[PDB]
Design a protein around this ligand. Structure first.
Ligand SMILES: C[C@H]1[C@H]2C(=O)N(C)c3ccncc3[C@H]2CN1S(=O)(=O)c1ccc2c(c1)OCO2
Ligand SMILES: C[C@H]1[C@H]2C(=O)N(C)c3ccncc3[C@H]2CN1S(=O)(=O)c1ccc2c(c1)OCO2
Ligand SMILES: C[C@H]1[C@H]2C(=O)N(C)c3ccncc3[C@H]2CN1S(=O)(=O)c1ccc2c(c1)OCO2
Ligand SMILES: C[C@H]1[C@H]2C(=O)N(C)c3ccncc3[C@H]2CN1S(=O)(=O)c1ccc2c(c1)OCO2
Ligand SMILES: C[C@H]1[C@H]2C(=O)N(C)c3ccncc3[C@H]2CN1S(=O)(=O)c1ccc2c(c1)OCO2
Ligand SMILES: [Cl-]
Ligand SMILES: [Zn+2]
Ligand SMILES: [Zn+2]
Ligand SMILES: [Zn+2]
Ligand SMILES: [Zn+2]
Ligand SMILES: [Zn+2]
Lengths: 338, 343, 338, 338, 343
C-alpha cells in the first residue's frame, strides 16, 4: 500500500479520524509519558528571577485509531506536517514567562507511530522559566529551579501526565554553567493543580544549582579584605601625622561603602540581609573603628605631656594586635557558619 | 441506544449543518449579553517605576449564555471541547484598556479552554501575559503604597449589546505562595466599574485594583544606613585638633561630596519626576548636616586666627557645643522624619 | 431578514461587492474624516528622539454600496471580521518608527454602518513616532511633537483626509506625563506630500510639551550650586593651610567636571550648546577661579613679610565679597534670560 | 468593462497569468529600475557598527502580459492585494541585519500599471544595515555607509537591477542627524556578486557621513584641557607644600586615566590607536610630567642649602614657561594634522 | 511547441503529478545523501557574557530526487520560483547549538530553488543565527576561542537521511569580512557530531571557527593604565620621608585605583570562578602598589626617634626601594609576557 493511501486511510480524508476527540474518549484518561533532553541551560538571572533552557520535549501515549497492520515495520517515522491531523496533549509550562518553537530550517518536530498505535512526539523548545530565589546565603547559596508540565484544558479524568520510568531527564554531555554547578540529582514531583475550573495534571522537575565561590573571592571578598588591611597601616603611622591617618580612615570608610553597594548591584532589591551584607557591614565597622581609634589617639594626646602621649601610644600598640586578632576571629565564625 | 458521534454533534451544533453564525451575538434582538469574569493570577512582577507599569500572567475566565449551544443529546452536564472550536462560536471582545503589551500563549498548543453546558452556558478560559500601565505617586517613596489597576473593557459592543460583571464568588484568585521581592501584595482587592463614554458610544468596563506596599529593608541597607554613616563620619571632625586643618577639611570635603553622589544615586532607578520625595528630604537634610560640619570648622579656623587665649577658647567652645548639638539635632530630625512617614 | 442573508446580500457572496474598488471610483475623491482618542502618551525619549502613544483611530467615510433599507435602525454594529470584506482607506503614519495592532483578546476594531452608507471604523493602535527635538534651552525647553496621517497608495484625486470639525483629538481624563506638561491646545494642519509617485493627502496634529523644571533643580542646579558655595569656604581658611585650600580647589573643580558630563548623560550627543551647558561651564569657571585665587595668595605671600602677607590677606577679603556677588549677578542674568 | 472583470481577465481566474514566470522568460533578462526615498535615517551605532533607515523602495519594470487597451487611462492605480497575483523581482538588501514591512493601518504598498505593461511598485521598509567603520581619526572621522540591493534567486541572465537615471535617491526635506552631516553627494555603483551558485545583479548606494565636532569639544577635549591647566598651578605653589603639590599631581593623573577610558566607553573595542587616544595619551603624559617635576623639586632641595634651593626654584620657573609652551606646540601639530 | 511552464510544474510536482512531499526520495532504499555548504555573509556580536555569536549565512543543500528528473527541456537546470519549495520534499536541517534563528522575507523570501535534468536539487536559504560558543577565558585577553556550528537532522535517523560537507570549498567567507576584536583564521575544521539520543541516531556535521583575540585594545584600556599607576606609586620613594601625608596619599590612591582597575577588567565578562591572565596581572600590580605603601609605613616607623642611626636606616630602605621595585617589576613582566606570548 502506497504511503499516500495509507496516510489517507489512517488520519486523512477517508479515515474518519477526528483530532478533536481524545483516544478512548468514553474510557479512562489518556496516560501520557514525558521525558526531556536538556540541550542548553543558562541565562540564570537573579534580577528578573528566572532562567532559560533549550529542550527536546518528548511525549508518549497510545491512540488505538493509529494502530496499523499494513506494514511489518515496528514503527513509522512520519512527516511532521501530519501532527496537525492527529490528537495530541495540550501540555504547557506553568511557570513559563517566555516560550517559542523552532522553525529553522523546518519545524523542529518529530512524529513516530507504532504498530499498536503508540505515538512518540518530540519537539524542540526554548523556555524562560521563573525561578524564585532565596538569597539569604548569597553568594554561598544553592537555588532550586523548577519546571512544571501541566494540561491547560483537560481535567484528570480525561488526561494524566507522568514522568517516564527510565531516565526522564537527560542532560547534554559536557554542559556547564559559568556561575553554577548543576547537580546530577533532579527531584521529580507532582504539582497537581486545583483551580475553580477543575483539577489538572501537573508534573514537576527540580534542578539544584550550587553557586560557585571563586568569582566572589576575586571580585568582592579579597578586595574588601585588602581595604581592611589598608586601614591597619594607620596604627604604624606617627600620631603627629593627623592628615595622613585621617586620610587613611576616610578613604577606607568611603571605599567600603561603595564596595558595599557594589556587592548588591547585580541583585534584585530584596529587603532581607544576605551573607555578603553581613561581611560588608562588619568590614565597614572594622574600618570605621580604625578611624575612631585615631580620633581617640589624637584627642587623648592634645596636651603634649608625657603621661598623655604614653596613653595615646598604648592605644596604638594594643590596636596593632587587637584589630587583626578580632578580624581573624570574625573570619573563623563567618566561614565556619556558612 | 447509540449515542450521537461527537463529529456529527459538533457539525449540528456549530458546524456546517448548524446554521450557527458566530457574527451574531446571543439574543441579538433581546437584552445585552451578561458576561461574568474572573481571573487567576499565575504571576505578578516586573513592577517598574521608570516605565511606570507592571506585568501579570493570568488565566482570564469568561462566562455567558448562548441558547444556540444548549444540548440534549448527552446526559453530561457539561462538555469539554477542543479549543479549535472557539473560532466557530461567538465570544465577547474583551480587551484590557490600560494594556501596553499583551500576548497569548501557544506552546505547546493554544493555552485555551472551552466548556459548554446543557443549558447553553459557556466557560472560556485563556492564558495571557499583560504589561499594564500603573501611574505611580512617589511623594512618600520609598515608604509608598501604590495602586495598580486592570481594566477589562468591550471594544466594539455598547452597553445595550454587551455587559461585563465580576463573578460573585472569588472573582480574583492568586496562586499560592506568590511573592514579590520589593512589595507586599495586599489580600484585599477593590472591584469597581470604569464605564467608558467615548464619541462612539458607551462601553462596559470593569476594574480590579491591587494594593502594593513597598518593603523598607532594601532602602535601609542601600540608602538610609550608608547615609547615616557619612553623617556620623562628619562628626569625628569635632574631636580632631583644630590645628589639623587639612584633616578636618578633608573630612568636610569627602562627606559633602559623598553625600551629593549618595543623593543622585537615590533617584537613579526612578522616573524623572519634578516633585520632592521622602528620600529627597532625607538626603537633603543629611547633606545640610554634613555641610554644616564643614562650615563649623571654617568658623573654628577663622575665629582662632589670632592665636590668643580668648579666641582659642571661643573656637574650642564652638567644638564642644558641636559635639553635643549635631548628634542631638540629628536625633530630633530622625524622630520627626520617621514619625511623620511611618506612623 | 436574517443578518446572515443581509450580510451576504450587502458585502458577501451574492452582493457583487468588490473591496478593491473605492466608493464612487469614477467620481470625486473619497472624503475621509478622522479623529483620534489618546488613551496613553509617554516614553518621550531624547536619545532616540521619539515618543509613544496608544490611540483609537476613527475614520469616517461614505460608501453608497453599503446603504440599506432592510432595517429601521439608523446604524448597525457589525462583527469586525467583516472589515476584510469592505473597502477602506490605506491610512499610514508617515513619521512612525514602530506600530502595532492589538489582538487580545480579539481584534481591537470596531465597524459601524449607517442607513445612508456612511461607515465608522475605529481601531486601536500603539505608535512610536519620531519627534526631532531642539535642545538649545534644555532643560527649560518646549518641544513640538507631530503625528502625520497619510495615504500610501491613493493620490488626491482618489482619496482625501480631513480632521473632523468637532473635537478631532480627545485625550483621556487625568492623563499626565512625569517630565512634561501636555498643553491643551493642539495645532491641526495639512502636510500634503509630493513624491515622484504623485501627490498624497496628509493631515497632521501637533502637540506641545513643556518640560517640568523641578527634577533639574534637585538633580543638577542645586547640587552644582552647593559645589560653588563649597569652593568659597576656602576664602575663610588660613592661608598657611595650603593642603586644605588646595584640596578644596581640586575636589570642587573635579566634581564640577563630572557634574558637567553627568548633565548630558541622558541626552543625544548634539554638537550645540544647551542652557544646562552654559550653567555648568560658568559654575566650573567660578570654582576654578577660586583655586587660582589661592595660587595667587600662596604666591604673593612667599616672603613671610608684613607687606606681602597683607597683600595676600586683601586678596582673600575681597574674594569673600566678590565671588558670591559675581555669582549672584550671573544668576540674575541666567534665570531672567531663559 | 467593469474593474472586476478586467482584473479577472488580466491577472485573475480567466487570465492564464502565472506569477511564477518572469516577463519575457525565454528572452533577455528583466530590466528593473530602482529608486529610493529616504524618509528617515538614524540610529548610527559605532558599537554594533550599523545604521537604520526608513525608505520607500520603488521598482519599475515591463511585463507585456499586463498591457491593456480597455481603458484610455495612461495608468491604473490598483489595490495592493493584487501584488500577490503578479510577478515581481526578489530584491533583498545584502548588508541588512534587520528588515520589516509596514502593515498599519494596511499594507504600506503601492501598485500602478501602465498601458504598455510597465509596472511601478513601491513599498515602505525599515532596514538596519551594517556599516563597518574606520575609527582611526575619531572623532574627526568621516564614514561611508552603503546599501546594497541584490537579487537572491535570479542570475544576471534572468534579472538585472539598475538605478534610475533621474534622481535615484531622494531624501526627505529637513532631515538631519544629531551627530553627523549627511553629504548631498551619494555614490552609485555596481556590486555584482559571484557565488558558487552563480552571478547575481547588485547595485549599491554610498552615503557619506561627517561627524560633528562640537559634542567632543564639550565632553572630552575641553574638560581634558582643564585638567592639564590644573596640573600647572602646582608650579606656582610653594615647594615646601609637599602634600598640596603631590595632591595636584595624583588627582590630575587619576582623573586623566578615567577621562581616557571614558573617551572610548561608547565605542567598539578596536585594537588600533584613534585620534582621541593620541590626545588623551599626550594629556596624560603632560600631567604625569608635572608630578615628576615636583618629585625632582622635592628631591634636589632635600639639603636645605641656598645652592640646592636655588636649583629647585629654577626647575619651577622654567616649568612655568615650558609646560604651557610645549602644550601649545603639541596643540598646533595635533589640530593641523587632523 | 515546448510545454508551458504552468503545465510542466503541474505534471512534475503539482495537481496531476502524484508527488507527495511527505515521502523522501528513495524511501524504501538507502538514506538520502545531502551535501551542504555555507556562505558567511556576516559574522559578529561575539559576546563573552551570553557566551554566543551571530552569523548571517546562505545555507546551501544539495540532494537527488528522482521524481524531479525531467526531459521536457534541453536545459541542464531550471531556476524555479521559491513558492514551489512548499510542494517538494526537503531535508529538516536544524542548528543544534542555535539560540536564535530567523528567515529573511524582505522584499520576498530569501530562498533559491534550482532543479537539474537528473533530478538533483539545489536549495539555498538566507539565515541569521545566534549560536552558542562556550568560551575558555583562562588566558584572557590573550585567548583564542573555538566557535562551532552544528547542522543536524531533527526527525530523520541515519538510515533515512545523511548530511555531508561538500568536497570543494564547503565554507566560503565574504571578501573583506573583518571583526573588531578578533581575527577569524582561514583554516576551519570540519567534523562529524553524530548524535545518539533515546529517540535514535541522527546525522550531524560541524564546522569550527578559530578566533584569535586582538591585543591592542587591552594594552590601551587595561595594561598601560595599570602600568602607570604602578610607576606613580614609585615617585613616593623620591619624596621626603618627612612628608607623611604626601607619601600616604600616594599609597592610598594607587591602591584604591588599582582595586577599581581590577574590577573594571572583569566588567564585560561572565562571572567565571577561575583565575584569568588579566587577573594575575591586576593582582600583582595591586601587590606592588600595596608594597610601596607598606614600604613607607616601615620608613615612617623606623625613623620615629629622630636620631642619625635610625634616620639613616630609613633612608637606606628608600634608596634600595628606588632600585628594587622597578627591577622586580621588570622581572615579573619578563615572566608574564614570555609565559602567555609563548605557552
Ligand atoms: C469528544 C470530546 C468532547 C466533544 O467534543 N464532545 C461533543 C463530547 C461529546 C460527548 N462526551 C464528551 C465530549 C467532549 C469530551 N471529548 S474528549 O475527552 O475527547 C476531549 C477533547 C478535547 C478536549 C477535552 C476533552 O478537554 C480539553 O479539550
Ligand atoms: C446581527 C448583528 C449585526 C448585523 O450584522 N446585522 C445585520 C444587524 C441587523 C439588525 N440589527 C442589528 C444588527 C447588528 C447587531 N447584531 S449583534 O448585536 O449580534 C452584534 C454583532 C457584532 C458586534 C456588535 C453587535 O457590536 C459590534 O460587534
Ligand atoms: C477600480 C480601481 C482601479 C482598477 O483596478 N481598475 C481596473 C481601474 C479601471 C478603470 N479606471 C481606474 C481603475 C483603478 C482605480 N480604481 S480606484 O479608484 O477604486 C482605486 C482602487 C485601489 C487603489 C487606488 C485606486 O489607488 C490605491 O489603490
Ligand atoms: C518559467 C520559469 C521557470 C520554470 O518554472 N520552468 C518550469 C521553466 C521551464 C523552462 N525554462 C525555464 C524555466 C524556469 C525559468 N523561468 S523564469 O525565468 O520565469 C524564473 C522564474 C522564477 C525564478 C527564476 C526564473 O529564477 C529565480 O526564480
Ligand atoms: C513514507 C514515509 C513515512 C510514511 O508516511 N509511511 C506511511 C511509511 C510507510 C512505510 N514505511 C515508512 C513510512 C514512513 C517513512 N517514509 S520516509 O522515509 O519517506 C520519511 C518521511 C518523513 C519523515 C521521515 C521518513 O522521518 C522523519 O520524517
Ligand atoms: Cl585628598
Ligand atoms: Zn534533590
Ligand atoms: Zn482596597
Ligand atoms: Zn499650539
Ligand atoms: Zn562620494
Ligand atoms: Zn583548526
Amino acid at each position: 500500500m502506497s504511503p499516500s493511501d495509507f496516510l489517507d486511510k489512517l488520519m486523512g480524508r477517508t479515515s474518519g479520524y477526528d483530532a478533536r476527540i481524545r483516544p478512548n474518549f468514553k474510557g479512562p484518561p489518556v496516560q501520557v509519558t514525558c521525558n526531556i533532553f536538556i540541550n542548553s541551560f543558562g541565562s540564570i538571572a537573579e534580577t528578573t528571577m528566572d532562567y532559560r533552557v533549550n529542550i527536546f520535549l518528548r511525549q508518549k501515549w497510545n491512540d488505538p485509531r493509529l494502530a496499523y497492520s499494513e506494514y511489518p515495520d515496528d514503527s513509522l517515522d512520519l512527516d511532521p506536517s501530519m501532527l496537525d491531523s492527529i490528537w495530541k496533549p495540550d501540555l504547557f509550562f506553568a511557570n513559563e514567562k517566555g516560550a517559542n518553537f523552532h522553525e529553522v530550517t523546518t519545524d523542529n518536530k518529530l512524529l513516530r507511530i507504532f504498530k499498536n498505535g503508540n505515538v512518540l512526539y518530540s519537539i524542540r523548545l526554548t523556555l524562560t522559566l521563573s525561578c524564585p530565589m532565596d538569597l539569604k546565603n548569597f553568594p554561598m547559596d544553592v537555588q532550586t529551579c523548577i519546571m512544571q508540565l501541566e494540561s491547560f484544558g483537560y481535567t484528570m479524568n480525561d488526561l494524566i501526565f507522568e514522568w517516564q520510568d527510565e531516565a526522564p531527564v537527560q542532560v547534554a554531555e559536557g554542559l556547564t554553567l559559568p556561575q553554577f554547578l548543576l547537580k546530577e540529582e533532579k527531584d521529580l514531583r507532582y504539582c497537581t493543580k486545583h483551580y475553580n475550573t477543575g483539577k489538572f495534571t501537573c508534573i514537576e522537575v527540580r534542578f539544584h544549582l550550587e553557586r560557585q565561590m571563586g568569582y566572589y573571592l576575586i571580585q568582592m571578598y579579597i578586595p574588601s579584605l585588602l581595604i581592611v588591611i589598608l586601614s591597619w597601616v594607620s596604627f604604624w603611622i606617627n600620631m603627629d601625622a593627623a592628615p595622613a591617618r585621617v586620610a587613611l580612615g576616610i578613604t577606607t570608610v568611603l571605599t567600603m561603602t561603595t564596595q558595599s553597594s557594589g556587592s548588591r548591584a547585580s541583585l534584585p532589591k530584596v529587603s532581607y540581609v544576605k551573607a555578603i551584607d553581613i561581611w560588608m557591614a562588619v568590614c565597614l565597622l572594622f574600618v570605621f573603628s580604625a578611624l575612631l581609634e585615631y580620633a581617640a589617639v589624637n584627642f587623648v594626646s592634645r596636651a603634649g605631656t608625657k603621661v598623655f602621649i604614653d596613653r595615646a601610644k598604648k592605644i596604638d600598640t594594643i590596636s596593632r594586635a587587637c584589630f587583626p586578632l578580632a578580624f581573624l576571629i570574625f573570619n573563623i565564625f563567618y566561614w565556619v557558619i556558612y
